[PDB]
Amino acid sequence: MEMILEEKDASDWIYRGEGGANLVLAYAGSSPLFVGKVIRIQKARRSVLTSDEQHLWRENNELISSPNKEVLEQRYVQNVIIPLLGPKHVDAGVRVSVSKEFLECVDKKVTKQRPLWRVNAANVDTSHDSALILNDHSLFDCISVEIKPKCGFLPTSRFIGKENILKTSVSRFKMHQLLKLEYIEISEESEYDPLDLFSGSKERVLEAIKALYSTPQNNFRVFLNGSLILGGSGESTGRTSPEIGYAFEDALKGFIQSRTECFLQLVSDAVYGSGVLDRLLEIQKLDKLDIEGAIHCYYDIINQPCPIALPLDESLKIVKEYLIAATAKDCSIMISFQSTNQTFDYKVHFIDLSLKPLKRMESYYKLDKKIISFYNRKQ
Amino acid sequence: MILEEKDASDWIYRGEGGANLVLAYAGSSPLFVGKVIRIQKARRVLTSDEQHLWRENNELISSPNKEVLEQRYVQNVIIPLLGPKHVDAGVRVSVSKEFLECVDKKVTKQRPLWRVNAANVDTSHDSALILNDHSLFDCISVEIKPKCGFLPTSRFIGKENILKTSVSRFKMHQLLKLEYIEISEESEYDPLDLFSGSKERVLEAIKALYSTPQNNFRVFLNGSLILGGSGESTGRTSPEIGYAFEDALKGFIQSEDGHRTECFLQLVSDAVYGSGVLDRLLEIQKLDKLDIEGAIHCYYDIINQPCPILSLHALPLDESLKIVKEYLIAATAKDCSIMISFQSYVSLKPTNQTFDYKVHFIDLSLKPLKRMESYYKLDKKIISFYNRKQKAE
Ligand SMILES: O=P(O)(O)O[C@H]1[C@@H](OP(=O)(O)O)[C@@H](OP(=O)(O)O)[C@@H](OP(=O)(O)O)[C@@H](OP(=O)(O)O)[C@@H]1OP(=O)(O)O
Ligand SMILES: O=P(O)(O)O[C@H]1[C@H](OP(=O)(O)O)[C@@H](OP(=O)(O)O)[C@H](OP(=O)(O)O)[C@@H](OP(=O)(O)O)[C@@H]1OP(=O)(O)O
Ligand SMILES: Nc1ncnc2c1ncn2[C@@H]1O[C@H](COP(=O)(O)OP(=O)(O)O)[C@@H](O)[C@H]1O
Ligand SMILES: Nc1ncnc2c1ncn2[C@@H]1O[C@H](COP(=O)(O)OP(=O)(O)O)[C@@H](O)[C@H]1O
Ligand SMILES: [Mg+2]
Ligand SMILES: [Mg+2]
Ligand SMILES: [Mg+2]
Ligand SMILES: [Mg+2]
Ligand SMILES: [Zn+2]
């Protein structure tokens, strides 16, 4: 809680991964303060909330009075998310102080491990004085699996227009796959279908797990003692080629007594067993009107005119619930495994339950507009 | 039929861009009254590379000359994308070498000296293009050259060029243009406003275009230029310019003197925003999906050269072809104009006056494939100069 990480300390931390908003390094020293920990550091695109955000989240006073963005994230998870999702599998993390120069040194350090396109978009935000400390979930040999399940339900909103009726039967994930191909963000369409994974059925869960393994993209990753053996490093990756499969099968040696097929069934049973996806789904379902509905409430709230009648409090609630749901739609799950009736213990943890910026309603709408219009054109 | 030498005296200078000359008809023949003629300049039918690129368009590549080439381009490529209602591929008309020479000499005097320095009419062409004169509906016609109205978000923009994601191409190009004495001041016009879709920001852009028309804003009265440059960009609207124009509106707008201009702009802003013609164009501009810094790689694959500049070079050829076609189509959309005509529909708020209005796209030229390279250079020079000035602290 007091400490300040300094420039010398930067050498204790190694590239682990990143999303669009955060860098993650695993601790590689021997100080029991950081063994089995990762550090998550915010990137700046290449304070603290707006007035609108302050009002939107007013229900939690501590939340809206957050001194910086790390505390913000911490209280968001603690004060908003954990009450809906439960504390069993969720951890808001511990804030630690960092020196500007520790950050710059860390930024300089990991550049070469990062995907080029992530580097073009962003680096660490060296203006921050805090970072967040979390338990490394790839350490229970430990086999660790990450799933980014995305949104597991179909909109049903009275506010989806005639033209966009397909939004009602095809999943957001599937339609999005078309556009990503179009923008060269992936090479193949994914096999994974979120509706299977969230379907509650054993057969369909195993089906989705096989899909994630065939085309991991940025939705599936496996770690052995914290080292990447399947999946991308900071990005989506290509289909699992026979060569990659081969390597994965070998890497499984010792952990599984036999092996890949076994692993998938093992992953599937943990998923379907923990029923951890059910609570998540209910939170994703907080998006009750779809963006095509909620966007209207957004413009009432920032008090501009619908460019596209409820009382204020109602509009606020809808938009609030929208962002909470956006958090649930984009978070990840990590499942820790530790050793025919072979038996494995497992842990499940949610990660990346980030607070989403209110400004994003506008781009949420645009992107959604783009997904469906392009999907319609293609059919 | 064929326009001959004697028929040249019957067409007068109307304007030009970098690629074409346009004369309006002033004679009596029922064929050409209310029409313009558009004549390709030669900068002193398709290349092999282009024939490869547009292979999927057999009609296009079998065009017997450039005029028919442009006709089929608009018709078979653009119109399916933009729609047919506001677009005209126009009609081919035979012309004699002598007719083209006589036209060349005649209009020289009315042309910007720098246009003359760069090119004259291509007298080698046996054919020209005829279109409806959109300045003819007392008609007030306004041309808008809106340029590119969105910011790129391409994975292929390197970190040192990241400003390209926040500042419009138009705004950044202004600094460069100033530096080359191609303009006298920064335009106040912002394409993002015009393509924003918000009624407020459209008017703001119309006002901006009135203040600094450069080559983006023209107004005609019965086909006569009353605002904007002739065959080129023009300087900021002074109070003396503003006066002559307010007066020039006397009549067309029935309103207390000194207020006709602002009523005019409100009217243009309501027609543009009313018709939503710009949303369709914007999607076509958006066919530039990877920015030039993306598409350029696909371009070297296509002309079968080693890329002087991994994911992009691994694409199936069909895909690389698609991307470059879309780039050039988008380039057409980024450089085209809209002409909105007015005849005393939109309604004035002060005086209850109503106007009929017609909208037309012009200048949907086919961009040459070889230009991918110069596009890349220009883009480079634009972002690196802009970065320079920003470093200046
Ligand atoms: O950069 P990506 O690997 O493509 O993932 C991003 C990213 O997700 P991350 O938390 O993993 O980084 C976005 O979140 P931000 O980092 O930009 O805040 C998220 O955006 P939203 O959660 O705001 O929607 C978006 O998701 P989506 O495309 O569904 O909008 C998108 O992820 P995908 O590749 O899964 O699409
Ligand atoms: O000569 P300018 O008056 O400065 O205008 C030219 C334009 O000409 P037109 O609008 O008159 O057709 C060019 O097109 P070409 O005539 O040379 O084919 C065009 O070039 P591209 O469309 O091929 O890009 C260029 O546009 P840009 O600068 O965006 O490349 C644009 O110059 P402006 O910047 O003044 O519009
Ligand atoms: N607590 C953790 N334990 C182990 N690995 C983690 C942890 N948190 C994140 N990671 C890894 O780092 C990656 C990036 O973290 P994430 O919080 O998703 O970044 P962003 O907020 O930018 O999306 C994750 O996809 C995950 O693989
Ligand atoms: N159909 C038309 N009716 C009236 N004026 C036109 C028409 N087409 C072009 N013009 C005027 O002539 C100018 C030159 O035409 P354009 O096709 O843009 O040439 P370029 O291809 O060289 O840019 C235009 O900017 C416009 O002012
Ligand atoms: Mg993430
Ligand atoms: Mg995130
Ligand atoms: Mg022009
Ligand atoms: Mg042109
Ligand atoms: Zn290349």
Curated annotation (Swiss-Prot), chain B:
Drop me one GO molecular function for this one: inositol-1,3,4,5,6-pentakisphosphate 2-kinase activity
Top-level taxon: Eukaryota
* Enzyme nomenclature, EC number: 2.7.1.158
Query: Could you state one GO cellular component term attached to this entry?
Result: nucleus
What general EC class does the enzyme of this chain belong to? transferase
Please indicate the residue ranges that the annotation assigns to the motif EXKPK motif.
Answer: 143-147
| GO BP: any one term | intracellular phosphate ion homeostasis
- The entry marks the following residues as binding ATP, namely 17-20, 38, 132-134, 143-145, 218, 363
Write out the residues that bind Zn(2+): 297, 307, 313
Query: What keywords were assigned to this record?
Result: Acetylation, ATP-binding, Kinase, Metal-binding, Nucleotide-binding, Transferase, Zinc
Q: So what does this thing catalyse? A: 1D-myo-inositol 1,3,4,5,6-pentakisphosphate + ATP = 1D-myo-inositol hexakisphosphate + ADP + H(+)
**What Pfam families does the database record attribute to this sequence?**
Ins_P5_2-kin
Could you say which residues bind substrate here? 43, 115, 147, 177, 215, 335, 367, 371, 375
Tell me which cofactor or cofactors this protein depends on: Zn(2+)
Tissue specificity as recorded in UniProt: Strongly expressed in leaves and cauline leaves. Weakly expressed in siliques and flowers. In flower, it is expressed in the major organs of developing flower buds. Strongly expressed in sepals, petals, in the male and female organs of immature and mature flower buds. Strongly expressed in the gynoecium and carpels which are fused to form the gynoecium. Also expressed in the transmitting tissue and ovules.
Q: Which InterPro entries match?
A: Ins_P5_2-kin, IP5_2-K_N_lobe
Tell me its applications.
Answer: The gene coding for this protein might be inactivated to commercially produce plants with phytate-free grain. Indeed, while the role of phytate (InsP6) accumulation in seeds is unknown, it causes nutritional and environmental problems, partly due to the inability of monogastric animals to digest it.
The note on the cofactor says:
Binds 1 zinc ion per subunit.
Q: Which family does it belong to?
A: Belongs to the IPK1 type 2 family.
Q: What is known of its domains?
A: The EXKPK motif is conserved in inositol-pentakisphosphate 2-kinases of both family 1 and 2.
Report the protein's function: Phosphorylates Ins(1,3,4,5,6)P5 at position 2 to form Ins(1,2,3,4,5,6)P6 (InsP6 or phytate). Phytate is a regulator of intracellular signaling, a highly abundant animal antinutrient, and a phosphate store in plant seeds. Also phosphorylates Ins(1,3,4,6)P4 and Ins(1,4,5,6)P4 to produce Ins(1,2,3,4,6)P5 and Ins(1,2,4,5,6)P5.
Entry protein name: Inositol-pentakisphosphate 2-kinase
Its source organism is Arabidopsis thaliana
Organism lineage reads as: Eukaryota, Viridiplantae, Streptophyta, Embryophyta, Tracheophyta
